């Protein structure tokens, strides 16, 4: 299938500006040029133009409710339109809040989708469980069918319809979960693999297990939402919430590598790359670079090597 | 059970001063503040006042014999007293010599205890095997029942009584063993897991195996003696003998995590944090931080997250 | 058996000068001094004197064809001579091209040998598949029985006789394979373990597997050719083609440690240590030091420790 890159230069999901610069950074590092060189057809849709919503009064504790909700509706419309034409959507963030419009727009055309969430955090805090009014920590709360009506109506998200049930999402890389969020996953029985399970089983067993758990009897589309902070800070330092002890550069490449093998990758998010938080210019190139490597891996690049078929090299 | 932190700001176990500053460093980093927020009752016993022993002439090659012995007798009395009151002892070093009075004081109330020793070194050198007269490399020699009368009588340890047999200690993280020490563990048949065994089996298999080997038929109390240099120098650089190729931040957190699960942790040592050996102020914070992280892990903190029971978060 | 170190201060196999300084760097770091302290007899054969071949015109695209072939014929002669006298050969590079004269000279005395190649690269490019005319990326191509007559006759390699078949070589550490090389290994069915297989299986499973694959029914001599770049750049930075996401210091030590245990190590190469590519003097010592550690591991040094037999330490 072909591919369509969508830039989502948004940052209202948290106080730290800088993330709207993620897609620029990634593009300038040669993302699209490199994607063309694979067996995939690549089209660059460009960057979406977001606009501030006037007098965006905080809803209780939640900041920039309407801005985020508006941004996400617009994104969801773009995603689903591109999806309809039979293409694999690739979204560049931007903060985690853009996960909302991505999975919504995807599910409109594929209600039988499943989400694989690589991150150090669950981002499953509701407007009532949050200690921060930042929406980048609440995307999975606006998407679950079992959490519908468990928290009020935030101004801006009226268009949102819970598109997946807890029984459809797997978490890999958890190491900084809030009490409220950990409750919701214990209660709703969401399948996860925090760092402890990774140490216990190995990345191999992890992929081996997430797969059967989702594609066991019914094979379905895969939506991989990748938060750059899921890997260790020594690999991807330019992010808003670096947390020590994460997945290694090798583990991140393995996750995506297996995802390719299934051939069901239908959507993909590359969130939280904040080019401005690099303690040095080098820390920025390091982060950007692994994000680009992660994206090429999902689209065919293997570490054992690659070569075009129908071409005798000897 | 409740907890009692005991500081042992002692450094006569080696030439490099600075280790006596470990408990200060750790306290200032918020150790006790964070322990209180767990399901345990915490009491800060304060720092022990040690005094130099006048004209502490070197015993053959062993330096500061009496100062160390005295320090440890005093520590053993404070541990056993606190132990008696049904509490979990937590010792902050200080160099490894304080391992002596810690295990002695512990065993006085629990002669059926077992020692889990995380370290890159065995510290089983006797006054006759030692190339250095530093007692921080000999603590396990003063505690073994099979080594009793295998080396003379050092001035100051006449009070010491071999409290464990070689069949009761397991080592994890060995990568810098002297010929004499390796001979003793080979001959005495001490169960260990050097880095090669960890590479071979994985951390899960290591804990899976140290457990059954000790709590196989008879469950007993556990005393975790943690030397900070067991982890890799890129995690805990502020220590006296950093050795390349160690356990990772993730592996250290996994060891401690499984220890919690058994519910048998009865004593705990956090040795060798030397705040003065940080090449930069950042290498000090890093070390300090992981030692604090390791401590909280033993007392309930999990990576998957935590939450208080009897409190509906939804 | 005894050991003989042979320096191969050659660098015409690539543009980056500096590698010819590898053996010096390694000797100055005390390599031979530390080798003596093991259970092996050590003799330092010294450094080979190579000479430029006048008007060494490029063969099609292959640069310095005759210089490389000459150096390698001379090396092959020195290796086989040393091997004839019942000694384990140890070659210090130098660029990867020297792998040619080493395996050739070894096989002259042990046609039944097998090769374990630790590298991020396969170096199996032929004069026709190469995008560069550098001979450091083609050593395995001049050695395979299945590739004989599949590429023309390079001026200088007429003396070479394909000594091993694809069914005799195992690759560990691949993460940067060209299309033509990946074709040759898929076609010829060469056994390998790129980084993904290591992630999937663990180093233990890799060694457990490469061994039976070679020593299954017929045990035979082992020739370990070690490319310093097979480990991660954060361990061995001073090399010509660092590729991120490699084997760790712990994994490298484990490979070599298991090799010792079989007792079949008959030849060994330590290629690609370029002392002039260190961003700082510290990056050089780091690299040099791990190569030295890798060498000592192959000859008896274990992480659990060692001690001389027939010597009561108590
Ligand atoms: Mn995150
Ligand atoms: Mn996230
Ligand atoms: Mn110790
Ligand atoms: Mn130690
Ligand atoms: Mn290489
Ligand atoms: Mn090579």
* A203: exposed, middle or buried (Cβ count in 10 Å: 0-12, 13-18, 19+): buried
Tell me the two tokens of residue B294: 């390791």
Q: Which of A203, A250, A306 sits opposite C179 (nearest CB)?
A: A306
Distance of CA C177 from the midpoint of ligand 6 (Å): 11
Q: Do C174 and A305 touch (CB under 8 A)?
A: yes
Spatial distance between the Cα atoms of C272 and C236, rounded to a whole number of angstroms: 10
Question: β-strands B191-194, B222-227: how paired?
Answer: unpaired
* DSSP assignment of C249-307: HHHHHHHHHHHHHHT-EEEEEEE---GGG-SSHHHHHHHHHHHHHHHHHHTT--SS---
CB C48, CB C120: distance < 8 Å: no
Q: Which residues of B touch C303 (CB under 8 A)?
A: 174-175, 194-196, 245
Is B182 part of the contact surface with chain C (CB cutoff 8 Å)? Answer: yes
Spatial distance between the Cα atoms of A109 and A78, rounded to a whole number of angstroms: 12
Q: Would you call A237 helix, strand, or coil by DSSP?
A: coil
CA distances to A140, A160, A297, B290 from A145, rounded to whole Å, are 10, 11, 32, 39
Is A192 part of the contact surface with chain B (CB cutoff 8 Å)? Answer: yes
* C307: exposed, middle or buried (Cβ count in 10 Å: 0-12, 13-18, 19+): middle
CB C7, CB C46: distance < 8 Å: yes
CB B170, CB B117: distance < 8 Å: yes
Q: Which residues of A touch C195 (CB under 8 A)?
A: 250, 253, 303
CB C273, CB C93: distance < 8 Å: yes
CB A294, CB A92: distance < 8 Å: no
Helices (H), B47-135: 65-84, 99-107
* C77: exposed, middle or buried (Cβ count in 10 Å: 0-12, 13-18, 19+): middle
Chain centroid offset of residue B60 CA: 27
Omega of the bond leading into C49 within 30 degrees of 0 (cis): no
Q: Which is it for the CA torsion B248, B249, B251, B255, positive or negative?
A: positive
Spatial distance between the Cα atoms of B272 and B275, rounded to a whole number of angstroms: 9
Tell me the two tokens of residue C196: 């993904």
Domain limits for position C118: 1-314
Chain centroid offset of residue A243 CA: 17
Q: Do A200 and B254 touch (CB under 8 A)?
A: yes
Q: Which of C150, C202, C245 sits opposite A253 (nearest CB)?
A: C245
Q: How many domains does chain C have?
A: 1
Interface of B with C in 90-149 (CB under 8 A): 122, 126, 128-129
Is A2 part of the contact surface with chain C (CB cutoff 8 Å)? Answer: no
Tell me the two tokens of residue C136: 């450091």
* Helix, strand, coil abundance in chain A, percent, nearest 5: 40, 15, 45
b/e per residue, B273-302, with b = 16+ CB within 10 A?
Answer: bbbebbeeeebbebbbbbbbbbbbbbbebb
A interface test, pick of C199, C201, C233, C242 with most A CB neighbours within 10 Å: C199
- Give the residue among A12, A10, A40 at the shortest CA–CA distance from A295: A40
CA distances to C34, C94, C232 from C31, rounded to whole Å, are 5, 16, 22
Q: What is the CATH number of the domain that holds C269?
A: 3.40.800.10
CA distances to B130, C169, C212 from C218, rounded to whole Å, are 46, 15, 9
Q: Do C180 and A306 touch (CB under 8 A)?
A: no
Q: Which residues of A touch C186 (CB under 8 A)?
A: 307
Distance of CA B236 from the midpoint of ligand 4 (Å): 12
Spatial distance between the Cα atoms of B237 and A30, rounded to a whole number of angstroms: 37
Q: Would you call A115 helix, strand, or coil by DSSP?
A: strand
Is A43 part of the contact surface with chain B (CB cutoff 8 Å)? Answer: no
Spatial distance between the Cα atoms of A122 and A137, rounded to a whole number of angstroms: 8
Q: Which ligand is nearest to the CA of B137?
A: 3
CB C242, CB C272: distance < 8 Å: no
- Give the residue among B75, B7, B8, B89 at the shortest CA–CA distance from B42: B89
CA distances to A108, C172, C195, C223 from C214, rounded to whole Å, are 54, 14, 20, 12
b/e per residue, A24-45, with b = 16+ CB within 10 A?
Answer: ebbbebebbebbeeeeeebebb
Instruction: Locate the chain B residue with the closest alpha carbon to A200.
Output: B204
Tell me the two tokens of residue B198: 């960890």
Number of other residues whose CB lies within 10 A of the CB of residue B1: 11
* A162: exposed, middle or buried (Cβ count in 10 Å: 0-12, 13-18, 19+): middle
Tell me the two tokens of residue A79: 């995603």
- Give the residue among C192, C11, C15, C7 at the shortest CA–CA distance from C117: C192
Is A249 part of the contact surface with chain C (CB cutoff 8 Å)? Answer: yes
Is B201 part of the contact surface with chain C (CB cutoff 8 Å)? Answer: yes
Spatial distance between the Cα atoms of B284 and B306, rounded to a whole number of angstroms: 28
Resolution value, angstrom units: 2.5
What are the φ/ψ torsions at residue A31 (nearest 5 degrees)? -50, -60
* Kind plus residue range of the DSSP H or E element containing B170: strand B169-174
* DSSP assignment of A147-206: STTSS---TT-TT----B-GGGEEEEEE----HHHHHHHHHTT-EEEEHHHHHHHHHHHH
Number of other residues whose CB lies within 10 A of the CB of residue B161: 13
Radius of gyration of chain C (CA): 18
């Amino acid at each position: 299938k072909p591919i369509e890159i969508i830039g989502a230069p948004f940052s209202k999901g948290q106080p730290r500006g800088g993330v709207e610069k993620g897609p620029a950074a990634l593009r300038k590092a040669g993302l699209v040029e490199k994607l063309k060189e694979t067996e995939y057809n690549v089209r660059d849709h460009g960057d979406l133009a977001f606009v501030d919503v006037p007098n965006d009064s905080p809803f209780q504790i939640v900041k920039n409710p309407r801005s985020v909700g508006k941004a996400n509706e617009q994104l969801a419309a773009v995603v689903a339109e591109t999806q309809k034409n039979g293409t694999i959507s690739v979204v560049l963030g931007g903060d985690n809040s853009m996960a909302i419009g991505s999975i919504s727009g995807h599910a409109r055309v594929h209600p039988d989708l499943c989400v694989i969430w690589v991150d150090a955090h669950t981002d499953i805090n509701t407007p009532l469980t949050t200690s921060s009014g930042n929406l980048h920590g609440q995307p999975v709360a606006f998407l679950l069918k079992e959490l519908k009506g468990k928290f009020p109506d935030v101004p801006g998200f009226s268009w949102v319809t819970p598109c997946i049930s807890a029984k459809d999402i797997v978490y890999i890389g958890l190491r900084d979960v809030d009490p409220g969020e950990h409750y919701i996953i214990k209660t709703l029985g969401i399948k996860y693999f925090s760092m402890t399970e990774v140490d216990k089983l190995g990345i191999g067993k992890v992929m081996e297990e997430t797969f059967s758990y989702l594609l066991g009897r019914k094979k379905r589309p895969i939506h991989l939402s990748f938060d750059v902070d899921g890997l260790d800070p020594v690999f991807t330092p330019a992010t808003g919430t670096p947390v020590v002890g994460g997945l290694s550069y090798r583990e991140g490449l393995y996750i995506t590598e297996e995802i390719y093998k299934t051939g069901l990758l239908s959507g993909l998010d590359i969130m939280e790359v904040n080019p401005t938080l690099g303690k040095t210019p080098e820390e920025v190139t390091r982060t950007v670079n692994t994000a680009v490597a992660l994206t090429l891996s999902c689209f065919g690049t293997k570490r054992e090597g690659n070569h075009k078929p129908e071409t005798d090299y000897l």
